[PDB]
């Protein structure tokens, strides 16, 4: 077998189910006997077939259907390989979901992938569109030379008992088969020739996080575009994990982004890039004793130009599912104060409170102690900053070991080893900035209003909303949801963010994940669209600046799942078809978070008054990709030019098979012309 390129072919159109024979190529005899090597190919799929082999080498005869090697893609964007010679001999597989795409801006696009079979290192590696997707290590390294009775080299399918299996339909732009193992660097470069959309946050940036979720995107009145997202360190797991909130901005209309910062973060557990296991056992494991921030909301007060960042604050080892019922506050002298438990007291004995100037008081004696906290909630004893050891987390087999290191960090009331511990429920935190993220204010825990009967009261991620007209012009609103007397809720401020008031929008006690986003009508009234626990997106209306809301009404015509997915709905500044317009983003499948679509809803005045004054006609829908392509949480923003920016999760964030995937948070831009089918 010679060194280098054994075979190369360009521009091969493959009719679905027909495949293409490469048996007559000069190097077929070499390819049929490869001991190792590299395969790189550019392709465009025009087929909806579930599994589509791009390239394969194997035995096509009767009874030998499990003897073959193939690189395939799925209609849902997955990519992988299967190296087989019947299960008793070997069956090596490697794959990674949501690695490739099918359509972009209404047209089928090319993806570039590569498989590297490194005999020297006994390792197999998959790449696609500039990324190293997965790695398989095997003591008993195997390749094509190990398959019994190879008799064919095929493009667009795998020959099994004389039939074309895993049928591809489309075009193989180029394929190159090397006998040598090219370097990862060469493959990153080679496959990187085709990329769509861009990343704001990514594995390898200064956040030190390998994973990101929950996008927030907002264009400021100054023209600057800002963004935030969960920087999920311990895989893509929801809280009761180690998660910080990342932030970045663009001053050129969303073309390039700044080095990300971490405005909301905890230091009890170290922030580091770690590859979380994706096997059936390890994938379910999550960090047990870390404090975290989760689900960001960005908001701008156009009057003061101040920006705010909100997120849920989870004490050590807490998430929505295991939060304790209670406000986390205690009322003394008529004022609500954060309550604390001295570590040496009884398990449920919260006999202290954080009062004015962070001074900690003994509630029984009503006397101040020698302790206090600063604007970051870090402990001080007699003016000396208290510290404790930071934890590290590593996998030992399928077990996650969380252990102390020798690194000292400031002792915070939300840390598991703090001498004074906060009540284990969730909190609502925020910081403001007057210089577009150059600096942020002290930590402001605004959840003093959390109902004492509530398990959790959290934010609806995305952006908040400021009323532009009417009697409540200037009011700031942030959507919330909870497990208590009400599900949907809101917090609003009439003094530009200094103080907040909580509003219950319904009397539902089920605690469903009612994530919502707010949009303003021409007269200043508001319409809130939300995810529900039923098979539809609901709409509620307010005619009093968000103080009271109408009953939920199904959003007719926009399909969704029973469990639901967060949505993004925004106001657009210019009319579309001569009418005020709103734009909505959400996955459209009735099962699985896939088939994302951007809808344009035209606001019509019905002629009625009050809650029934307006009616939204969802006139246009725009499919972001093909039906099976993953699409989960998202956030829309009108950019300074006419365009609509979209930061979204390009994978199924619900699926137990698509957890812990890197670089799935993408940023794309669309013109109204494109969105309305006009092109
Ligand atoms: C505070 C919090 O846990 N937010 C979560 C919830 O929504 C998501 C989801 O993808 O559906 C992701 C969010 O980050 O999973 C959670 C679950 O649904 C319970 O609401």
Q: What is the DSSP string of 451-496?
A: -TT-SEEEE-SEE-EE--SSTTTT-EEEEEEEESS-SEEEEEESST
Query: What resolution, expressed in A, was reported for this entry?
Result: 1.8
| Residue of 269, 633, 651, 670 marked active site | 633
Regarding beta strands 568-576 and 427-433, do their DSSP bridges make them parallel or antiparallel, or are they unpaired?
unpaired
Q: How far away, in angstroms, is 238 Cα from ligand 1 center?
A: 6
For 611, list phi and psi in degrees, rounded to 5: -50, -30
633 given a catalytic annotation: yes
- Backbone break loci in the chain, preceding residues, C–N > 2.5 A: none
Does the annotation flag 108 for ligand binding?
no
Nearest C-alpha neighbor of 168 from the set 310, 97, 72:
72
Rounded-to-integer distance, Cα 305 and Cα 53, Å: 54
- Catalytic-residue membership of 104: no
| Helix or strand run (H / E) with residue 585 | strand 579-587
Name the 3-class secondary structure at 185.
helix
Q: Pick the residue whose CA is nearest to atom 7 on ligand 1.
A: 513
Q: Which run of H or of E encompasses 614?
A: strand 614-623
CA atoms within 13 A on the CB side of 99: 24
Q: What distance in Å separates the CA atoms of residue 545 and residue 217, rounded to the nearest whole number? A: 24
Per annotation, catalytic residue among 95, 131, 205, 238: 238
Q: What angle do CA 407, 408, 410 make, to 5 degrees?
A: 145
For residue 186, what are the contacts with CB-CB under 8 A and spacing of at least 6?
none
Sequence-distant (≥ 6) Cβ neighbours of residue 659 within 8 angstroms: 235, 236, 237, 276, 278, 283
Whole-angstrom Cα distance, residue 244 to residue 290?
A: 11
Q: Which of 425, 428, 513 to mutate to test the pocket of ligand 1 (most atoms within 8 A of CB)?
A: 513
Residue 558's alpha-carbon distances to 140, 175, 532, 612, in angstroms, are: 51, 41, 13, 20
Element (H, E) at 406: strand 399-410
CB 315 within 8 A of CB 268: no
Domains and CATH numbers, the chain: 1-196 (2.60.120.200), 197-324+425-679 (2.120.10.10), 325-424 (2.40.220.10)
> To which H or E segment does residue 30 belong?
helix 28-31
Structure tokens at 85: 């010679």
Please answer whether residues 450 and 425 qualify as being in contact, where contact means their C-beta atoms are separated by less than 8 angstroms. Answer: yes
328 SS3 class: coil
DSSP string over 233-297: SSTT--SSS-EEEEEEEESSTTSS-PPPEEEE---SB---------STTGGG---SS--EEEEEE
Nearest Cα residue to 54 out of 65, 43, 66: 43
H/E stretch holding 360: strand 359-362
Write phi, then psi, for 209 (nearest 5 degrees): -105, 140
Measured between alpha carbons, how far is residue 300 from residues 227, 294, 434, 526, 638 in Å?
A: 12, 20, 10, 17, 14
Is 406:389 a contact under the CB 8 Å cutoff?
Answer: yes
N-term to C-term CA, the chain = 51
- The ligand 1 site (C-beta within 6 Å) comprises 214, 238-239, 294-295, 312, 319-320, 458, 513, 653-654
Residue 321 has phi, psi (to 5 degrees) of: -65, -30
Which tokens is 29 given? 């005899």
As a whole number of angstroms, the distance between CA 616 and CA 19 comes to: 48
For residues 488 and 391, give the distance between their C-alpha atoms in angstroms, rounded to a whole number. Answer: 36
What separation in Å is there between the alpha carbon of 206 and the centre of ligand 1? 25
Question: Is residue 37 a contact partner of residue 178, using CB atoms and an 8 Å limit?
Answer: yes
Beta strands 516-520 and 476-483: pairing type?
Answer: unpaired
């Amino acid at each position: 077998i010679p060194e280098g390129i054994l075979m190369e072919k360009n521009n091969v159109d493959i009719a679905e189910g027909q495949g293409y024979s490469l048996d007559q190529e000069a190097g077929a005899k070499y390819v049929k006997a490869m001991t190792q090597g590299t395969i790189i190919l550019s392709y465009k799929s025009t087929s909806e077939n579930g599994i589509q082999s791009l390239f394969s080498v194997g035995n096509s005869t009767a009874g030998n259907q499990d003897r073959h090697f193939h690189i395939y893609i799925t209609n849902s964007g997955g990519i992988g390989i299967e190296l087989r010679n019947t299960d008793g001999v070997f069956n090596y597989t490697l794959d990674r979901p949501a690695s490739v795409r099918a359509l972009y801006k209404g047209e089928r696009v090319f993806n570039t992938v590569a498989l590297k079979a490194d005999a020297a290192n006994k390792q197999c590696r998959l790449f696609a569109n500039g990324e190293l997707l997965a790695t398989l290590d095997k003591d008993a390294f195997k390749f094509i030379s190990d398959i019994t009775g190879v008799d064919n080299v095929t493009l667009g399918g795998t020959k099994r008992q004389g039939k074309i299996a895993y049928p591809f339909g489309g075009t193989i732009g180029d394929i190159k088969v090397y006998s040598n193992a090219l370097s990862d660097e060469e493959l990153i470069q080679a496959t990187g020739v085709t990329t769509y959309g861009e990343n704001i946050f990514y594995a390898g940036d200064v956040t030190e996080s390998n994973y990101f979720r929950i996008p927030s995107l907002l264009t400021l009145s100054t023209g600057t575009v800002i963004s935030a997202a969960d920087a999920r360190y311990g895989g893509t797991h929801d809280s009761k994990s180690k998660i910080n909130i990342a932030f970045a901005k663009s001053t050129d209309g969303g073309n390039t982004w700044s080095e990300p910062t971490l405005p909301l973060k905890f230091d009890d557990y170290i922030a580091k890039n770690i590859d979380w296991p994706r096997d059936s056992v390890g994938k379910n494991v999550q960090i047990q004793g870390s404090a975290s921030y989760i689900d960001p909301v960005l908001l701008e007060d156009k009057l003061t130009k101040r920006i705010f960042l909100f997120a849920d604050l989870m004490p050590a080892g807490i998430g929505s599912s295991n939060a304790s019922v209670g406000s986390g506050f205690k009322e003394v002298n008529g004022k609500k104060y954060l309550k604390l438990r001295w570590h040496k007291d009884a398990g449920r004995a919260y006999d202290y409170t954080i009062r004015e100037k962070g001074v900690i008081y003994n509630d029984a004696t009503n006397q101040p102690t020698e302790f206090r906290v600063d604007g970051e909630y870090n402990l001080y004893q007699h003016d000396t900053n208290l510290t404790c050891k930071q934890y590290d987390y590593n996998f030992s087999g399928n077990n996650l070991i969380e252990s102390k290191t020798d690194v000292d960090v400031n002792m915070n009331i939300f840390y598991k080893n703090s001498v004074f511990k906060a009540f284990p429920t969730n909190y609502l935190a925020m910081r403001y900035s007057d210089d577009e993220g150059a600096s942020w204010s002290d930590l402001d825990i605004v959840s003093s209003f959390k109902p004492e009967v509530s398990k959790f009261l959290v934010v609806g991620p995305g952006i908040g909303k400021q009323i532009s007209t009417g009697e409540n012009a200037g009011r700031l609103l942030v959507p919330l949801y909870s497990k208590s007397s009400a599900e949907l809720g809101f917090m609003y401020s009439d003094d530009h963010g200094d103080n907040w008031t909580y509003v219950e929008a319904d009397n539902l006690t089920g605690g469903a994940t009612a994530e919502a986003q707010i949009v303003e009508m021409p007269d200043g009234s508001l319409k809130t669209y939300l995810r529900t626990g039923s098979n539809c997106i609901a709409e509620v209306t307010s005619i009093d600046g968000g103080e009271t809301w109408s009953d939920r009404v199904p959003l007719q015509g926009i399909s969704t799942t029973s469990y639901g997915t967060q949505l993004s709905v925004i106001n657009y500044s210019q009319p579309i078809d001569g009418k005020p317009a709103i734009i909505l983003s959400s996955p459209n499948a009735t099962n699985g978070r896939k088939n994302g679509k951007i809808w344009i809803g035209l606001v019509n005045d019905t002629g009625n008054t009050g809650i029934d004054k307006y009616s939204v006609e969802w006139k246009y829908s725009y499919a972001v990709d093909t039906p099976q392509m993953g699409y989960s949480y998202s956030c829309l923003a009108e950019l300074p030019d006419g365009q609509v920016g979209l930061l979204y999760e390009k994978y199924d964030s619900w699926s137990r098979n698509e957890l812990h995937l890197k670089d799935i948070l993408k940023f794309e831009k669309y013109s109204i012309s494109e969105l309305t089918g006009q092109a």
